[PDB]
Design an enzyme around this catalytic site. Sequence first.
Site, mmCIF file in Angstrom:
data_model
loop_
_atom_site.group_PDB
_atom_site.id
_atom_site.type_symbol
_atom_site.label_atom_id
_atom_site.label_comp_id
_atom_site.label_asym_id
_atom_site.label_seq_id
_atom_site.Cartn_x
_atom_site.Cartn_y
_atom_site.Cartn_z
ATOM 1 N N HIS A 82 0.800 -1.230 0.000
ATOM 2 C CA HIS A 82 0.000 0.000 0.000
ATOM 3 C C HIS A 82 0.839 1.291 0.000
ATOM 4 O O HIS A 82 0.642 2.184 0.824
ATOM 5 C CB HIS A 82 -1.019 -0.037 1.142
ATOM 6 C CG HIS A 82 -2.118 -1.029 0.926
ATOM 7 N ND1 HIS A 82 -2.177 -2.234 1.594
ATOM 8 C CD2 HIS A 82 -3.195 -1.000 0.107
ATOM 9 C CE1 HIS A 82 -3.247 -2.902 1.198
ATOM 10 N NE2 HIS A 82 -3.884 -2.172 0.301
ATOM 11 N N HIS A 106 1.095 1.318 -5.898
ATOM 12 C CA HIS A 106 -0.228 0.711 -5.939
ATOM 13 C C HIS A 106 -1.302 1.727 -6.334
ATOM 14 O O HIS A 106 -2.177 1.412 -7.135
ATOM 15 C CB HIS A 106 -0.565 0.059 -4.590
ATOM 16 C CG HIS A 106 -2.014 -0.274 -4.423
ATOM 17 N ND1 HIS A 106 -2.673 -1.170 -5.239
ATOM 18 C CD2 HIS A 106 -2.931 0.166 -3.531
ATOM 19 C CE1 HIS A 106 -3.934 -1.263 -4.856
ATOM 20 N NE2 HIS A 106 -4.115 -0.466 -3.819
ATOM 21 N N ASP A 155 -8.888 -1.658 -8.402
ATOM 22 C CA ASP A 155 -8.243 -1.973 -7.131
ATOM 23 C C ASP A 155 -7.928 -3.460 -7.041
ATOM 24 O O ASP A 155 -6.906 -3.858 -6.470
ATOM 25 C CB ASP A 155 -9.171 -1.572 -5.980
ATOM 26 C CG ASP A 155 -8.449 -1.421 -4.655
ATOM 27 O OD1 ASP A 155 -9.157 -1.300 -3.630
ATOM 28 O OD2 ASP A 155 -7.199 -1.411 -4.622
ATOM 29 N N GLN A 171 -3.986 -17.294 -3.570
ATOM 30 C CA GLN A 171 -4.268 -16.572 -4.810
ATOM 31 C C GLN A 171 -5.398 -17.217 -5.616
ATOM 32 O O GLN A 171 -6.200 -16.515 -6.231
ATOM 33 C CB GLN A 171 -3.010 -16.415 -5.671
ATOM 34 C CG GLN A 171 -2.074 -15.288 -5.237
ATOM 35 C CD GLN A 171 -2.806 -13.999 -4.889
ATOM 36 O OE1 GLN A 171 -3.425 -13.355 -5.742
ATOM 37 N NE2 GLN A 171 -2.726 -13.612 -3.626
HETATM 38 C C1 LIG Z 1 -1.965 -10.113 -5.421
HETATM 39 O O1 LIG Z 1 -2.907 -10.450 -4.396
HETATM 40 C C2 LIG Z 1 -3.529 -9.486 -3.636
HETATM 41 C C3 LIG Z 1 -3.531 -8.136 -3.992
HETATM 42 C C4 LIG Z 1 -4.175 -7.203 -3.180
HETATM 43 C C5 LIG Z 1 -4.835 -7.581 -2.008
HETATM 44 C C6 LIG Z 1 -5.491 -6.508 -1.210
HETATM 45 C C7 LIG Z 1 -6.953 -6.318 -1.601
HETATM 46 N N1 LIG Z 1 -7.557 -5.288 -0.765
HETATM 47 C C8 LIG Z 1 -7.106 -4.980 0.458
HETATM 48 O O2 LIG Z 1 -7.557 -4.021 1.069
HETATM 49 N N2 LIG Z 1 -6.153 -5.736 1.015
HETATM 50 C C9 LIG Z 1 -5.430 -6.773 0.293
HETATM 51 C C10 LIG Z 1 -4.857 -8.926 -1.614
HETATM 52 C C11 LIG Z 1 -4.215 -9.899 -2.386
HETATM 53 O O3 LIG Z 1 -4.198 -11.240 -2.071
HETATM 54 C C12 LIG Z 1 -4.202 -11.750 -0.740
HETATM 55 C C13 LIG Z 1 -5.630 -11.817 -0.199
HETATM 56 C C14 LIG Z 1 -5.829 -13.294 0.103
HETATM 57 C C15 LIG Z 1 -4.953 -13.645 1.296
HETATM 58 C C16 LIG Z 1 -3.537 -13.607 0.711
HETATM 59 C C17 LIG Z 1 -3.776 -13.204 -0.734
HETATM 60 C C18 LIG Z 1 -5.062 -13.928 -1.036
HETATM 61 MG MG LIG Z 2 -7.850 -0.842 0.150
HETATM 62 ZN ZN LIG Z 3 -6.254 -0.176 -2.884
#
Ligand SMILES: COc1ccc(C2CNC(=O)NC2)cc1O[C@H]1C[C@@H]2CC[C@H]1C2
Ligand SMILES: [Mg+2]
Ligand SMILES: [Zn+2]
Length: 347
Positions: free
Chosen positions: A72, A76, A230, A281
């Site tokens: 973050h 991003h 996002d 994932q």
């Molecule tokens: C590239 O993967 C991600 C990219 C971005 C996010 C953000 C989405 N929004 C959020 O506010 N926080 C996490 C999460 C991602 O994956 C993780 C979430 C699950 C637990 C581990 C992996 C699978």
């Molecule tokens: Mg967010």
């Molecule tokens: Zn975001």
Amino acid sequence: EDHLAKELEDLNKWGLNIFNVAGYSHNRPLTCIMYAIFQERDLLKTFRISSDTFITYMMTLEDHYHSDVAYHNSLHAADVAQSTHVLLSTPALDAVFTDLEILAAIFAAAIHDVDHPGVSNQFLINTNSELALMYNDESVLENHHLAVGFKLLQEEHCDIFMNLTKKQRQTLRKMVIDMVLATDMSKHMSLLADLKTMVETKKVTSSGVLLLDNYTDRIQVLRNMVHCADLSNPTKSLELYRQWTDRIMEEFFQQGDKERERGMEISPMCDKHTASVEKSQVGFIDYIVHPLWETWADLVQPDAQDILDTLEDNRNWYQSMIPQSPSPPLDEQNRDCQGLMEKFQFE
Ligand SMILES: COc1ccc(C2CNC(=O)NC2)cc1O[C@H]1C[C@@H]2CC[C@H]1C2
Ligand SMILES: [Mg+2]
Ligand SMILES: [Zn+2]
């Protein structure tokens, strides 16, 4: 210098490698990409925003992103702005959105994660932090992002909405607040269900262009657009997607370090070695990312088909990469810790 110029040729493209522009933007990619986007759309000259005010605001905003946070950080935010800009150019939305709605979308994307500490809402809630106590545990970070995004207009040489009409500013504000609050992950199901409802009653012209007569329909699309942007990481070429995955795991595990350090016992996280990166994932795509993008591909039928193919392939790649040699996965073998998907979920 001149390498920046060549990379910015992919500006209107999904295949833009934002990591490369990061290196040539002098570690300042959001201001860079935002300046590029605003010129390509003539937004500065449309809304009477000079170079001075714009750059100053963007520099101020970008500096309010944390450079020590793995995922973050401003890159991003740069990524989400650029992706949003592509999605606005989608054929099925041609001439649909007004200049103020376009301005709102990209700006919302830019500020949508500003001043992110690299911990989840729940971490802030469990620790009794100021922000949790101020926002009543309700979209804690997302509220903060908007608050910061707009407060920074008040700093010296920073009001980029200076010359807007009192009406236009009020409308811009309403849209931006709406789009960014929609990025709350605990609101995902709620939002997807309504988007499906909007597809089920979609209206189009013979050329294929969508018809969205009134504000309620227009705002709903933009919500889901910025929300898709996002959650676009898994829909990018696997060269980028894997970088984003690496970055999110570093941030999430760093949250896990904090939780131990502070001796939190509320739903403990499974440490770096025992976690299943690849299956997470896959679950991420299956339960969240694919349902949303499939619905989006329906809405812009069939403009996002290439994006959707890329996603499906990426899913099968991570699926193939799941090692069966520890069975069940380690995080399932520990009744105390919680796996990546388990801890993240429960929304
Ligand atoms: C590239 O993967 C991600 C990219 C971005 C996010 C953000 C989405 N929004 C959020 O506010 N926080 C996490 C999460 C991602 O994956 C993780 C979430 C699950 C637990 C581990 C992996 C699978
Ligand atoms: Mg967010
Ligand atoms: Zn975001």
